[PDB]
Amino acid sequence: MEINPYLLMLNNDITSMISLTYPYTGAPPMSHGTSTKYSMETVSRTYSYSRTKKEVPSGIFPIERRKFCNTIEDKENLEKPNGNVDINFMLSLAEMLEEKMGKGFFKFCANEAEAEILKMHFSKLTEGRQTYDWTSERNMPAATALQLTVDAIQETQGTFKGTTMVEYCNKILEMMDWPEVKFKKVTLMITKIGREEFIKRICTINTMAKDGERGKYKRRAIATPGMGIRPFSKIVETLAQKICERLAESGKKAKLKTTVSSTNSKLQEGQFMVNITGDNSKWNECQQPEAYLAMLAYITKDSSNLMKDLCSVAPTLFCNKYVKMGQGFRAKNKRKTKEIVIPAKKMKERKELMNAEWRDLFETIEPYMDGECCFLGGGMLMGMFNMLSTVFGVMTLNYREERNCYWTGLQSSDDFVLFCISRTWPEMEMTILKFIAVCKLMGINMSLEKSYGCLPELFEFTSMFFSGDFVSNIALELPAFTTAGMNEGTDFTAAMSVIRTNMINNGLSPGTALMALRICLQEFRATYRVHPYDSGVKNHRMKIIRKFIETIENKDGLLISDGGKLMNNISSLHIPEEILKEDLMDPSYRNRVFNPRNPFTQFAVVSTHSFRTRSNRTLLNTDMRAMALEEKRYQVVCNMYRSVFESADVNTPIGSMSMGEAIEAKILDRARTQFENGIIGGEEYSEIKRLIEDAKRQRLS
């Protein structure tokens, strides 16, 4: 007898039998080895989509520049994707865009944007992902690379007194005007670097492999920028963020109901609607930032004078960015015994030891190679402008050709749903080929392999498959239920918070919540080696619980991490376990657990089990021990400044003078205020005064 699960779909919908077709219970795919061929595929395919050969020589950079606007070599194979944008066409779509809603639209949204730019402190830069530190040429978190950048500022010339966004940006351009910049290398020597190398290094973007992505056979390369490119991109993403928040054809469940319900009221006696789910392919290789420069020169053709000059720098830095080339490749003999490693530096000299595919990719990228990097001039990689291409999507979806056959829909990052209204099917060929025409002109390439349509709502948007009446829900990530691993107290309630927030937003029917609740209980007990008292587990932690259980009067007041059973349920996922067990505890047990005088807690739930495990042991055995000396000195100085200001973790400590002078001013302030209403003693005031004066003479020296 044969067997087939998909027969469940013979008398059901795809709103119920679609969680059957997500393989989220298994391991995600990982990358291996170098990430060189993916980067060469991205850049080589980007120049292969250029549709031109017109090169312009450069005087700043020693390599040629190929332009990407208005120089088209129209091959007959137009079904292949193009990377050329016509600027009068898209500016015509912008002038057509603002004439639909309001008159003073871009001035309004841009004035609100600048109203949020000037009131921004640059610690917002430290709330980001990993970036590329150019001092040691590595990947570091944001506060580390910003601290090394400001360290290069205050080491090179003068000090930094900005404490804003705009003065930091002007400090970046001031670094661009400098003829020589000194920084520190590794055991901390101090070196210098010239002017052109600083220009080549501020425009350096690191490439790597996207690890753990569900939905592709071939792996894809993601790129991370440095530090000096991030805040201008933050400015542009706030501007286009306000624009996308103001628009009404962008994204998620109500707007499709309003546009389907509204566009069903715009039908005549012979017209009808056909929707098409598409998927714009090669989206990261067909968005050139020059059109971002022209259109942001429209939205800042009418803003002001400062915002006009500040919103036109990050598209230039995307116009002449570099690309890191991974770390090379490996070679081996016929016996497969010795395997030499060739990095990205010596790839030019050892060109003749590669494969056929590698030489095909490498000889079409040779006239753009630097020593360690490559020169890309039209690409928009991952980890870049996301809320700005959506504006181009709405511009394609608000076209007016003048019948009464037209289209509308909804746009996402690279996912769109399109609705057409027409009378006959050859007219549908006319209108859809007009849509492929306007998207093909503007630089948006729809894939033909991954598109379809029907008459009613049976479409696909951001993995939500909308049928004619019902709504499919998003298949969530299963490992997100258990991600804490930090405490015996801040893991179970964190899991109940994840079940709660996945219950409110998604559907998440209650028996799944009880089942995953009991399963996360089971992995909690299995992780922290704690079992209930009536179980037959005999390890080094259940013997003590087994021997002393006679002292406990009421048995169900023990905590789960101490050998108690479960009392939380679905209707109490918002309340931690500790309070619902604090209404039943024994007085020796309640007075015994909740002592703050314990060797574990001294040296959001109730922290009575919070202990700190030992760290790793490559923290004092690698060559970067001086960095651990830096984190120890930083923890000492931060404990000093925290020791003076008794309440400093509540408000952000703004100020631009110095830290130690504010410390001495504060100890003199509380010395005088606590003097005259307080202390009063000559040895204490003159002795503390003597330590302040001697410490100020010591600090000045």
Partner: protein, 511 residues
């Protein structure tokens, strides 16, 4: 306040990266400030329409939904790390103090007599027979001396490879030679295999009840109010009372205990080879017992990154005749006789080398989280049914409702087996566990494209006249990612049989 720091090099930079019909940024800004559109836009639009050559493809006239190309080549072998269907286990009553896995290994060394475990040095088939023979004798006397540390001999130095890696020489010294040590690089891709025929028997075996009862160590039930907790508790009791009996639960507990023990031994002892049992724990006639399926040997893992691919050696206990088609990577030896009272049938020792990884542990060791999509699916079925009837019909709906599965082998046209809904959740936990085993790239891309074809079948079910623009590259992308994973090829075959069953009523397909 309103002045940006006008530098010297950047004003030469922004003037360089303008479009081609412009000279400076100033001329570009003065044209963009005074831009008015025209109606020659439609001439460029229609001029883009004329040189297109693109037509849509309907389905009512040209229903070219052809079935997929299964590779008609050599049959794909059995590639799971353990044995599911062909297992044999020795039992004992479980002792509470003797609970650690080496204690279980020793107590099953006295319980199952390994003194009668005599193997010939000649296998039935395989590749290397002497190495596994001296390895089994060496680990058998090693468990006889009750210490789990394999002393270094040439057999373990050959199997779990010590020194089997290339000499990674950096490009600081290279000492080149005239036409000697000619080095380069080379990649191939993947090898292509064919349709497995044994997967139906392990499917039907894996969803059949096994007399040992519960297998998965679940937890206790929380107290219930007068709320809907009676409903969710009732569904947990019925569904959990169904999934605890099948062999899928035995495989899940096998992966949890076995890969848990190899996981903690990969943490506690790097650089030392251990001897780890392969076992379970389940209740028999009320008395909690434990099993013993096989013997595993670790390969001195120094897990630097999430990969690392340490060597696992599996000695296995089977009671069936081997197969040079299915059991192809194995090195089938033998054991002797086992008394099985229903007479004293044969007992075969199997051997296999394989590998695990550090990322391929935590998704196996925490594979208990498969009761979420099954209960989500059955719960959406029942809640959509009572949502469309608007009456509390749950406990009687779980018995008087059919589910069409498992068409026969000789004929397929509308010849289905309608089963009860708890057998449906049996098949759902089977297919979710098979998803948790065989996850590779090919399954992911094939799940994407079968979401597309499922959208086409739903487009067939209500007569909506779906359409596509280019079908050639579609079947080029589907047939690219169906190479050697047996679950993907099997689901492709069952997708083709889905089209053959659905072709009997709707008209969008082929024969």
């Amino acid at each position: 306040e309103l002045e940006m720091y006008k530098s010297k090099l950047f004003i030469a930079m922004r003037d360089e990266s303008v479009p081609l019909p412009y000279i400076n940024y100033e001329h570009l800004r003065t044209r963009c400030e005074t831009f008015k559109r025209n109606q020659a836009e439609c001439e460029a639009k229609v001029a883009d329409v004329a040189s297109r050559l693109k037509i849509k493809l309907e389905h009512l006239e040209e229903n070219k939904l052809r079935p997929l190309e299964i590779p008609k080549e050599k049959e794909a072998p059995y590639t799971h790390k353990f044995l599911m269907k062909d297992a044999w286990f020795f039992a004992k009553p479980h002792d509470s103090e003797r609970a650690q896995p080496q204690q279980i290994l020793y107590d099953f060394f006295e319980a199952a007599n390994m003194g009668f475990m005599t193997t010939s040095p000649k296998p039935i088939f395989g590749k290397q027979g002497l190495m596994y023979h001296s390895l089994w004798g060496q680990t058998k006397r090693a468990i006889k001396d009750k210490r789990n540390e394999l002393e270094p001999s040439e057999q373990r130095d050959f199997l779990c490879g010590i020194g089997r890696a290339s000499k990674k020489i950096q490009e600081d010294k290279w000492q080149e030679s005239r036409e000697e040590e000619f080095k380069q690089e080379e990649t191939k891709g993947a090898a292509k295999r064919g349709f497995p025929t044994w997967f139906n028997e392990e499917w039907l075996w894996a969803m059949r009840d096994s007399k040992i009862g519960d297998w998965i160590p679940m937890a206790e039930m929380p107290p219930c109010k007068n709320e809907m907790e009676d409903y969710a508790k009732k569904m947990c009791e019925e569904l959990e009372s169904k999934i605890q009996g099948t062999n899928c639960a035995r495989e899940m507990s096998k992966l949890i205990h076995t890969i848990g023990s190899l996981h903690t031994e990969c943490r506690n002892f790097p650089g030392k080879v251990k001897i780890v049992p392969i076992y379970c724990r389940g209740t028999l006639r009320g008395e909690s017992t434990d099993c013993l399926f096989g013997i595993a040997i670790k390969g001195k893992s120094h897990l630097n990154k999430d990969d690392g691919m340490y060597t696992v050696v599996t000695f296995e206990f089977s009671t069936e005749e081997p197969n040079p088609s299915k059991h192809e990577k194995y090195t089938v030896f033998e054991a002797g006789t086992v008394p099985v009272e229903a007479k004293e049938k044969k007992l075969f020792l199997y051997c296999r080398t394989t590998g695990m990884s550090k990322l391929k542990n935590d998704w196996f060791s925490k594979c208990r989280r498969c009761l979420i999509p099954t209960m989500e699916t059955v719960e959406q079925i029942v809640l959509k049914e009572c949502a469309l009837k608007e009456e509390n019909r749950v406990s009687e709906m779980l018995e008087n409702k059919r589910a069409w599965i498992a068409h026969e082998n000789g004929e397929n046209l509308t010849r289905l087996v309608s089963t009860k809904l708890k057998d449906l959740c049996r098949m759902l936990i089977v297919t979710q566990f098979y998803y948790c085993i065989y996850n590779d790239n090919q399954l992911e891309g094939f799940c994407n494209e079968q979401k597309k074809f499922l959208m086409f079948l739903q487009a067939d079910k209500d007569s909506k006249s779906a359409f596509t623009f280019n079908q050639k590259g579609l079947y080029e992308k589907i047939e690219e990612c169906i190479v050697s994973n047996p679950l993907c090829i099997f689901l492709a075959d069952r997708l083709n049989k889905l089209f053959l069953v659905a072709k009997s009523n709707g008209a969008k397909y082929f024969e």
